[PDB]
């Protein structure tokens, strides 16, 4: 199942994407 | 890490900012800064932070802990960043940028605003704060001097000579002289404010000191306003005096040899705070360091990959 891959993808490059304040 | 009194960093265009000290000229930290490259860099009053800016967004690194990244970043231009600069308590940000502007921010979280906006007919390639942090001098690519006072909102535009790009402007810490280099070389020095009073702005052209055939690209003060270094596109770098503006000292990274064909500009200098040793940042892929009296380099950090065109060297107060 792609979708359950894709959303382990986003959240995962998400928990470390929002960092930073611009 | 930055926790001692002389800190040094230089950027360039091999996607890293290098920070190191003169002891044994080896690297400390290496900042990641990616998908541009870095017009100037300038480190905080209060010692916490630096700031790089190039191309629509000014980036800050942390100077206490260790971070490689851009905790704080600042977008909403849409072309470079000329040079950025902090008030000396660490109040606002002057910013100019490529396109037509040059304006402030505020540096905390709340709804002061008292970010302005200064718009011209020219992209701007310089922006210069008055040491009484009240006026500040904007130079174009059509060689304009905006004296512009915060004040107030009407601006001064002076015109030396057109035709000719500025590139730089600066003034000495002690408001004794007011100097600037083109496109060809030319480097003017006008009398600055006399009227501590009430900022009356008079400006009268005392020299034009004719020198470096070749683009002069930065011009710089000293602390002590005894001297005043300028780079330029010839490989060299000379300081001259105060006195009667002769020529003091000259530096030179010229092999001469016909083969290399200007291998590499000067792109920056700066002073310390005793006005006895210079940093300079040479497109060489390296940086020097030199004395202003026995004219030899003494030191070299060579850890860079590509061309750097920005360099940050301050100290402490006392020299």
């Given at each position: 199942?792609?979708?359950?891959?894709?959303?382990?993808?986003?959240?995962?490059?998400?928990?470390?994407?929002?960092?930073?304040?611009? | 890490?930055?926790?001692?009194?002389?800190?040094?960093?230089?950027?360039?265009?091999?996607?890293?900012?290098?920070?190191?000290?003169?002891?044994?000229?080896?690297?400390?930290?290496?900042?990641?800064?990616?998908?541009?490259?870095?017009?100037a860099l300038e480190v905080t009053?209060?010692?916490?932070?630096i700031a790089?800016?190039?191309?629509?967004?000014?980036?800050?690194?942390?100077?206490?802990?260790?971070?490689?990244?851009?905790?704080?970043?600042?977008?909403?231009?849409?072309?470079?960043?000329?040079?950025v600069g902090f008030?000396?308590?660490?109040?606002?940000?002057?910013?100019?940028?490529?396109?037509?502007?040059?304006?402030?921010?505020?540096?905390?979280?709340?709804?002061?605003?008292?970010?302005?906006?200064?718009?011209?007919?020219?992209?701007?390639?310089?922006?210069?704060?008055?040491?009484?942090?009240?006026?500040?001098?904007?130079?174009?690519?059509?060689?304009?001097?905006?004296?512009?006072?915060?004040?107030?909102?009407?601006?001064?535009?002076?015109?030396?000579?057109?035709?000719?790009?500025?590139?730089?402007?600066?003034?000495?810490?002690?408001?004794?002289?007011?100097?600037?280099?083109?496109?060809?070389?030319?480097?003017?020095?006008?009398?600055?404010?006399?009227?501590?009073?009430?900022?009356?702005?008079?400006?009268?052209?005392?020299?034009?000191?004719?020198?470096?055939?070749?683009?002069?690209?930065?011009?710089?003060?000293?602390?002590?306003?005894?001297?005043?270094?300028?780079?330029?596109?010839?490989?060299?770098?000379?300081?001259?005096?105060?006195?009667?503006?002769?020529?003091?000292?000259?530096?030179?990274?010229?092999?001469?040899?016909?083969?290399?064909?200007?291998?590499?500009?000067?792109?920056?200098?700066?002073?310390?705070?005793?006005?006895?040793?210079?940093?300079?940042?040479?497109?060489?892929?390296?940086?020097?360091?030199?004395?202003?009296?026995?004219?030899?380099?003494?030191?070299?950090?060579?850890?860079?990959?590509?061309?750097?065109?920005?360099?940050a060297?301050?100290?402490?107060?006392?020299?």
């Open positions: 199942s792609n979708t359950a891959q894709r959303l382990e993808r986003l959240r995962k490059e998400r928990q470390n994407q929002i960092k930073c304040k611009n | 890490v930055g926790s001692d009194p002389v800190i040094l960093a230089t950027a360039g265009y091999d996607h890293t900012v290098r920070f190191w000290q003169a002891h044994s000229g080896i690297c400390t930290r290496t900042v990641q800064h990616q998908d541009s490259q870095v017009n009053p209060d010692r916490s932070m790089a800016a190039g191309y629509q967004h000014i980036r800050m690194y942390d100077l206490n802990s260790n971070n490689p990244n851009p905790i704080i970043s600042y977008d909403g231009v849409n072309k470079n960043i000329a040079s008030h000396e308590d660490g109040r606002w940000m002057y910013t100019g940028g490529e396109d037509c502007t040059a304006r402030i921010w505020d540096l905390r979280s709340r709804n002061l605003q008292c970010q302005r906006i200064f718009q011209v007919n020219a992209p701007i390639n310089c922006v210069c704060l008055h040491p009484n942090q009240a006026e500040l001098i904007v130079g174009d690519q059509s060689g304009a001097i905006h004296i512009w006072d915060l004040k107030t909102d009407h601006n001064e535009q002076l015109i030396p000579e057109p035709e000719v790009s500025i590139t730089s402007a600066h003034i000495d810490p002690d408001a004794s002289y007011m100097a600037a280099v083109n496109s060809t070389g030319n480097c003017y020095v006008w009398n600055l404010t006399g009227g501590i009073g009430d900022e009356v702005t008079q400006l009268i052209p005392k020299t034009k000191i004719p020198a470096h055939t070749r683009y002069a690209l930065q011009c710089r003060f000293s602390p002590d306003s005894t001297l005043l270094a300028t780079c330029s596109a010839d490989q060299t770098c000379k300081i001259w005096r105060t006195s009667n503006f002769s020529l003091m000292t000259e530096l030179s990274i010229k092999s001469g040899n016909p083969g290399e064909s200007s291998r590499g500009w000067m792109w920056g200098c700066a002073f310390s705070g005793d006005s006895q040793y210079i940093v300079t940042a040479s497109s060489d892929n390296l940086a020097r360091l030199w004395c202003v009296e026995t004219g030899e380099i003494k030191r070299e950090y060579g850890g860079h990959q590509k061309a750097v065109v920005c360099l060297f301050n100290d402490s107060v006392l020299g």
